[PDB]
Swiss-Prot record, chain A:
Pfam families: Globin
Protein name: Hemoglobin subunit alpha
InterPro entries: Globin, Globin-like_sf, Globin/Proto, Hemoglobin_a-typ, Hemoglobin_oxygen_transport, Hemoglobin_pi
UniProt PTM: The initiator Met is not cleaved in variant Thionville and is acetylated.
Organism: Homo sapiens
Residue sites binding O2 per the record: H58, H200
From Swiss-Prot, chains B, C:
Effect of P124R: In Khartoum; unstable
Effect of S49F: In Las Palmas; slightly unstable
Substitution effect: N139Y: In Aurora; O(2) affinity up
Outcome of swapping L91P: In Sabine; unstable
Documented effect of changing H116L: In Vexin; increased oxygen affinity
SS bonds (residue pairs): none
Binding sites annotated in the UniProt record for heme b: H63, H92
Consequence recorded when altering T87I: In Quebec-Chori
S-nitrosocysteine, modified sites: C93
Organism: Homo sapiens
Outcome recorded upon mutating V67M: In Alesha; unstable
Protein name, as recorded: Hemoglobin subunit beta
């Protein structure tokens, strides 16, 4: 998460931005609409022509919100609480788009801060924008509610002793459906029935079992595994979403009565939380 | 798009057993429940407040049927997904303003629904073939965005 | 890769001003600093302990030159990226076990590096053209994965 040196780097960079925040915010948007045209689907009510007052005023609003974030770097969820509500309940922009605007903001700063945009500052600014994006999307579905926790414990209870079997199936579904994931297992026999896959599936399942048992203290229960993925195995974070989907498909195929729409939603939120914890120490 | 003989056979085999009405309404409903920001396109459908309200909503079921109906016709033209969906791609961009990420979210939910409905028959190789098909259909629907 | 002739010229014109060896070393070093999990392939390269050590590592710079040299010759074949990169795709999959997500991360870092190098010259339409190209190259390098 944002270290104090990260915070120092962002403060210095944004201070140099200074009175140009608004102009750079407008440029970042323009870059985004041009490079990623699908983001225009959220603004069909604007004149998106170059230099338009709507794009300029929106850029200033975005830049001010970032300024607020830089000045309250230690209390971001609180400083941006109003904006997180607005995007979650009213604007409902798909979370993938935040990565697109973050990239365009980073390109804009690079183009305008030759002296300041060093490798370490680049790293710090990317982390900062990721954290902002995370806070702004945090209420789309929110924390695990007591109803979610109940649904997860109920479904996993029904999994019971088959947890290991289901972990192996999920891996097999992943390797077939998303072949790029096989790049992390060059030392495995990945054929159907492989004992290496079954042994690994059981390890993965056992860890999920521990996570369910510690659902209110998941970061500490999963700490050694977070260390291991972040500093040794170093699996790209995108891959956790693919295994999560394949675990959900496995549960759906084995739990005809238990896999209701509500339990589906709760499980998807639970596996995203597990995925978050497992990638929390990457950077 | 290219599918191996094995993959095409698996897709068409399972789809012959799919009631598009029933699966279509399940898939769209679960989309709105699991990824609630997708509700932003359906303000006129009424009450989407709770999962039972969403799943029971007759406009959700009707719209779901329409969508998987169009998907179904797409599986008749697997070799030319882009040409098949061109007109609907333009509609979704120019008139409806739908972020194409929503097509990928629908794809994920549809795979889950098939697995739920068919159980053990939705084997790992069958899933992998459907994964190719739902990605191809989403790419086809996003093709004319600008 | 279908770029407009305007986009092609914009990509070509800027690339003529690039010091491939310097930009290649810069792009790969920033990749390893900003997304440190990509260091997993490079443990034989010696000291990667600080940003300064990464950026100053002669093995990182040499690999950067190699990678961007291949990128650079690819720019002469914008209408046939898949064929140009076919054998390299197979090597990265079968022998090097590189997750194709890494090509996308390098793409993002290269665009940042170009913006840093060229400042105002790196305009929003020029960036948009380079975004298509880095996506195009990443897709070509991932094409033979199986
Ligand atoms: C760093 C990320 C972002 C920040 C800090 C941010 C912040 C803001 C702020 C401050 C407002 C105005 C609130 C008000 O006037 O009450 C706003 C509005 C809005 N945002 Fe976000 N935003 C971000 C990302 C995005 C993304 C990625 C999109 C879509 C691609 C988006 C779409 C919108 C829309 C459609 C509006 C309303 C515009 C209007 O009708 O005035 N936002 N944003
Ligand atoms: C639901 C998310 C995940 C969980 C709970 C999880 C957990 C684990 C566990 C428990 C281990 C074994 C640690 C030990 O040796 O004691 C492990 C190892 C490993 N994981 Fe993860 N993992 C997850 C996702 C992933 C993903 C997405 C990939 C790659 C696509 C991955 C790749 C690996 C690799 C390569 C190993 C080492 C295999 C070996 O050499 O035995 N993991 N993981
Ligand atoms: C599997 C992908 C999809 C296909 C094949 C598809 C197909 C269709 C069809 C056949 C129509 C009828 C349009 C007309 O009457 O001319 C339609 C309309 C519509 N679709 Fe899509 N669709 C898909 C995905 C989605 C998704 C994921 C969303 C949004 C989350 C969406 C939102 C809409 C909306 C808002 C309408 C208009 C309904 C109205 O008249 O109020 N579609 N779609
Ligand atoms: C635009 C993207 C890329 C291009 C054009 C490219 C190109 C190349 C070339 C030309 C080689 C030499 C192969 C040979 O010896 O015949 C190579 C090797 C290699 N590449 Fe890639 N590459 C790219 C991205 C990446 C990335 C992002 C990574 C990993 C983070 C990576 C990791 C490697 C490794 C580990 C080698 C082996 C080098 C050695 O044996 O010393 N590549 N690449």
């Amino acid at each position: 998460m944002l270290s104090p040196a990260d915070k120092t780097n962002v403060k210095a960079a944004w201070g140099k931005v200074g009175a140009h925040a608004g102009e750079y915010g407008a440029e970042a948007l323009e870059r985004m609409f041009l490079s990623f045209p699908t983001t225009k689907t959220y603004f069909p009510h604007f004149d998106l022509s170059h230099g338009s007052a709507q794009v300029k005023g929106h850029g200033k609003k975005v830049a001010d919100a970032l300024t607020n974030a830089v000045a309250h770097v230690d209390d971001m969820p609180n400083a941006l609480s109003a904006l997180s509500d607005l995007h979650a309940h009213k604007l409902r922009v798909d979370p993938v788009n935040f990565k697109l605007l973050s990239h365009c903001l980073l390109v804009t700063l690079a183009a305008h801060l030759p002296a300041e945009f060093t490798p370490a500052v680049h790293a710090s600014l990317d982390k900062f924008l990721a954290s902002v994006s995370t806070v702004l999307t945090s209420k789309y579905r929110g924390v695990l509610s007591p109803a979610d926790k109940t649904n997860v414990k109920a479904a996993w209870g029904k999994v019971g002793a088959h947890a290991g079997e289901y972990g192996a199936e999920a891996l097999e579904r992943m390797f077939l459906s998303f072949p790029t994931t096989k790049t992390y297992f060059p030392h495995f026999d990945l054929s159907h029935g492989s004992a290496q896959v079954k042994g690994h599936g059981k390890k993965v399942a056992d860890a999920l079992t521990n996570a369910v048992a510690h659902v209110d203290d998941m970061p500490n229960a999963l700490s050694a595994l977070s260390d291991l993925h972040a500093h040794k195995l170093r699996v790209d974070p995108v891959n956790f979403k693919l295994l999560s989907h394949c675990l959900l498909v496995t549960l759906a195929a084995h739990l005809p009565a238990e896999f209701t729409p509500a339990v589906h939603a709760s499980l998807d939120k639970f596996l995203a939380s597990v995925s978050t914890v497992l990638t929390s120490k990457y950077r | 798009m290219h599918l191996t003989p094995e993959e095409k056979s698996a897709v068409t085999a399972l789809w012959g057993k799919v009631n598009v009405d029933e699966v279509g309404g399940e898939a769209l409903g679960r989309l709105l429940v699991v990824y609630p920001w997708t509700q932003r396109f359906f303000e006129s459908f009424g009450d989407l407040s709770t999962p039972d309200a969403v799943m029971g909503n007759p406009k959700v079921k009707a719209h779901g049927k329409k969508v998987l109906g169009a998907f179904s016709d797409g599986l008749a033209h697997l070799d030319n997904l882009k040409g098949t969906f061109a007109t609907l791609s333009e509609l979704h961009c120019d008139k409806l303003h739908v972020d194409p990420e929503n097509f990928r979210l629908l794809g994920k939910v549809l795979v889950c629904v098939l697995a739920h409905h068919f159980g053990k028959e939705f084997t790992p190789p069958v899933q992998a073939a459907y994964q190719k098909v739902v990605a191809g259909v989403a790419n086809a629907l996003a093709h004319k965005y600008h």
